[PDB]
Amino acid sequence: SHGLFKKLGIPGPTPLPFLGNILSYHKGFCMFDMECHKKYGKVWGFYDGQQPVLAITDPDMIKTVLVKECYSVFTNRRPFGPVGFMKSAISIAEDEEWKRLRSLLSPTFTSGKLKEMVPIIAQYGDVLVRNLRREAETGKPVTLKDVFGAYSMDVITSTSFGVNIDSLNNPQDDPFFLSITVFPFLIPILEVLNICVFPREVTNFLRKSVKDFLQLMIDALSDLELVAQSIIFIFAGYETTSSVLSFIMYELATHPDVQQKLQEEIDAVLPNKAPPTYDTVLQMEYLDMVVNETLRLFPIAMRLERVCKKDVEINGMFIPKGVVVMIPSYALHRDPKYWTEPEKFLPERFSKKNKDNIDPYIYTPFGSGPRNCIGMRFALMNMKLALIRVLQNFSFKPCKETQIPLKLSLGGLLQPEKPVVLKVES
Amino acid sequence: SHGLFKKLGIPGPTPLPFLGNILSYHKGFCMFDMECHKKYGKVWGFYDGQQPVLAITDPDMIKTVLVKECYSVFTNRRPFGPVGFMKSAISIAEDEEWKRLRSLLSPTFTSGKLKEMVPIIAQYGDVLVRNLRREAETGKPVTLKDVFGAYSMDVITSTSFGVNIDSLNNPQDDPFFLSITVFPFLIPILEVLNICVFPREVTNFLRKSVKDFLQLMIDALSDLELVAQSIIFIFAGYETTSSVLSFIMYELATHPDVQQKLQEEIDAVLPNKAPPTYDTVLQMEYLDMVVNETLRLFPIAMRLERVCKKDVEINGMFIPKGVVVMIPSYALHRDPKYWTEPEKFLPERFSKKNKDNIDPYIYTPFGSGPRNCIGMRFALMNMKLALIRVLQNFSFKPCKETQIPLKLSLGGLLQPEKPVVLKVES
Ligand code: HEM
Ligand code: HEM
């Protein structure tokens, strides 16, 4: 099975038997992606065990895969297991089942239902300053992913349901997945065992805690299929939110000529520390020119993936069935051929002046097509609503223990090695 | 493989393919054991999947298996998995490894180290009355396995380490094992996955909480092998203790002519509510004649098991290798041929007058032989030390919701269906 890329004339790193190419993950997904983009060119192939992965960099191919032929050939993501009752969640569902669930869950992030969420988010952005004013008034670094996490936690529990808890009460919230890929034929076994990658007690904790996004559901849909959708929203709305807030907070304290220039637009549209509304936010381009630049540097999903469900010949290339087409986000976001000095944080790539020479099938940090980030709008609203309410009250400087430059986690997920700490000044 | 008991001329219930006889577990281990003792006689056989189990009732065979030929042919228990680092714990260890660990852990339950534990147990037997005086002074049933559990928890955390917590702070503390037996060939897989029957977070909770019985350890032994031994002691010292306390408490409120007659010996050896010492306890025969009668009725382990590691011919019968010899405790404890009116709770079977006509290879509620209950003494001390400190202060009467007669759990473990509740009067 490992001669599929020798056959189709597609170059690649040679795969070891049984293991495939995962031996080269020893530095991380991202570094293995940038590596081969230099090694073999515009299209290369590798194997995740016996699993052949096609890496595409041509932005038309990318468009064909995510948008044009999404509904036809590349509908679903890579098989990930074992999960259990979670097989119904949207980021996991496939074919016809996903269609019924992406329709049903689209109503949540409209321009009308998101504006309904700015005044309720205006409540926890003040539990964020008051919990960041206690660790500022005293000389002491600050662990951004706790206070932002405590924040991002509070936001998601309400933007969808309605529960309210100051995450200082500490409400709730790659060791073995390594074997998934060399033993994907073992996933069918683990299922008939109820066994979960999500420990069966984080789920039983919520196999009853479920029994607004909650409203707009029961308002056709099932009930064990109702539990799962709350889960994903809770993870993404917490983890992804806090993670990037601290990611930008690092690039603001280590680039203070940008931290002040962003603080000089915040006191222009919102004078006298004016609370942010749905519309004042969308005005601010630098806050966008930054958020889009950090996400151009730290794409929190690194790669997009789709599963080629039949023989196709997109943009000149015969693609066989069962292959995983993989858009290597992190590697493009930092490609020289498309970004000058790409290691450098320069929110002026997303200036209206320059955001013309910017191809949205290279910078896709929320994906694209009918299966793109369904929370992208809610995400880009939830972040800047906290980015404003914090760059009005505090300016951030390096610490003594602040990881400069920031070491990305060479393991799996995209996070820093040591957590981002920063000195906060009022 | 399922023709092993047709071969050896041993009668039994006919086994379905692949499943074996576990279909007959639909009423519980115990009822399936009593059933076949009537069906086929003194020796019968059945299959736990492909796993042949030999049930022996002859008390000499039983003696040959537990005591005489224990070190030789029947050393270890049934293979139970998957476990992980827990493969070193004593109740699990086998062959040579178990010898090094039953020696090392014998010093804990001497007459000298147990007497050192009566004054420290005299401390939580008073947190038991004061937590049972709050639910008595007010008219309200009492859930015995909480207050006893809260008690039995407190005792074991100190009798071995030294930590002290009133278990009212709520400190810490058959869905899928059904597949173990039909798929025992899947246990080798699950191991290379770190996967635990004990959820990997109840263990990570203590993969660091470990880093007296604690003293007598590091005083040769390992450290990941030190964590496991604390675990078993914590379960057995908590669960088994509370469970039987409530088991006797049921048989004392539903047999009050015994509850008073035991309260009439307690105020004889310990006058003026005298605190119990190591020696006053051993004096009291009825408190023993009861504890031994409840355990004759509710044997908390139901069956003893050993694994026949080579061809043998004990007491006339050729026994092949790899068979699990199983002493059906629950079925003997309630055998007519050895106990008149065996359903009836009558602590006078264990009177010194009658405890002569009583064969200790039939009543073995702590087993026997070199692999018997290592905590039996500590157990029979920990229980009566709470049985005294409670039958001095309170008398127990039926409630309106008290399960009379007591329905045993027809699932797996030996517990009641509804928890035992009782009205407590001071
Ligand atoms: C900075 C924050 C976020 C980023 C960078 C991000 C990025 C992404 C990406 C790259 C994808 C995959 C798209 C593809 O492969 O085609 C995705 C999918 C998804 N995201 Fe997010 N996301 C963010 C926040 C959120 C939030 C707050 C939610 C709240 C529910 C969310 C829910 C989802 C869902 C449901 C999907 C899958 C949609 C589907 O498969 O139909 N994301 N996101
Ligand atoms: C009423 C209370 C208890 C009862 C009825 C009981 C009963 C038993 C039984 C029937 C066995 C199996 C013997 C065999 O199959 O040969 C056993 C083994 C064992 N019990 Fe208990 N037990 C009790 C309390 C305890 C306590 C408090 C501990 C504390 C550590 C404990 C620790 C153990 C250990 C370590 C073994 C296995 C010894 C070995 O395999 O070497 N038990 N017990």
DSSP annotation string for B69-120: TTTTTB-S-------SGGGGSTTT--THHHHHHHHHHGGGGSHHHHHTTHHH
The span from the CA of B74 to the CA of B209, in Å, is 35
Which ranges in B159-207 belong to alpha helices (H)? Answer: 177-182, 187-191, 200-204
Cβ of B193 within 8 Å of Cβ of A179? The answer is: yes
Cα B280 → chain centroid = 25
Pocket-testing residue among B145, B373, B377, B382, ligand 2, by greatest number of atoms within 8 A of Cβ = B373
Q: Is the CB of A387 under 6 A from ligand 1?
A: no
Phi/psi at A31 (5° precision): -65, -30
Minimal CA–CA distance to B420: which of B410, B406, B167? B406
Q: Is the CB of A76 within 6 Å of ligand 1?
A: no
Q: How far apart are CA A335 and CA A329, in angstroms?
A: 10
CA B171, CA B12: separation in Å to the nearest integer? 47
What is the least distance, in Å, from the CA of B210 to any CA of chain A? Answer: 22
Task: Tell me the CA end-to-end span of chain B in Å, nearest whole number.
Answer: 61
The rounded Cα A110 to chain-centroid distance in angstroms is 20
Domain segments of chain A as ranges: 1-426
Residues in B closer than 8 angstroms to A193, CB to CB, are 176, 179
CA–CA gap between residue A280 and residue A387 (Å, rounded) = 13
Say whether B195 and A192 touch across the interface (CB within 8 A).
no
Q: For residue A98, which atom of ligand 1 is closest to its CA?
A: 41
Question: Do residues B353 and B344 touch, judged by C-beta distance below 8 A?
Answer: no
Q: How far is B150 from chain A (nearest CA, A)?
A: 22
In order, the DSSP letters of B44-75 are EEEEETTEEEEEE--HHHHHIIIIITTTTTB-
Task: Let me know: does A144 contact A246? Beta carbons within 8 Å.
Answer: yes
Q: Does A192 touch chain B (CB under 8 A)?
A: yes
Which of A176, A200, A201 is facing B193, going by the closest CB pair? A176
Residue partners of B313: CB distance under 8 A and separation at least 6? B319
Q: Is B196 annotated as a binding residue?
A: no
Name which of A175, A189, A201 is nearest B186 (Cβ-Cβ): A189
**Helix (H) or strand (E) segment spanning residue B194:** none
Which phi and psi (to 5°) does residue B16 adopt? -70, 150
Q: Which atom of ligand 1 is nearest to the CA of A379?
A: 27
User: Max Cα separation, chain B?
Assistant: 66
For residue B212, the CA-to-ligand 1 centroid distance in Å is 54
Hey, is the C-beta of B185 within 8 angstroms of any chain A C-beta?
no
* Helices first, then strands: H and E counts in chain A: 18, 9
Cα-based distances in Å from B268 to B293, B303, B350: 22, 37, 20
**What's the rounded Cα separation, in Å, for the pair A329 and A57?**
9
| A window 221-240, beta carbon within 8 A of B | none
What 8-state DSSP symbol labels residue A159?
A: T
Contact B201 A201 (CB under 8 A): yes
Q: Which tokens hold the place of B396?
A: 């127990």
CATH of span A1-426: 1.10.630.10
A111 contacts A120 by C-beta, under 8 angstroms: no
Q: Ligand 1 pocket, A307 CB below 6 A?
A: no
Query: Which of B192, B195, B201 lies nearest to residue A195, judging by beta carbons?
Result: B195
Closest CB to B201 among A176, A189, A199: A199
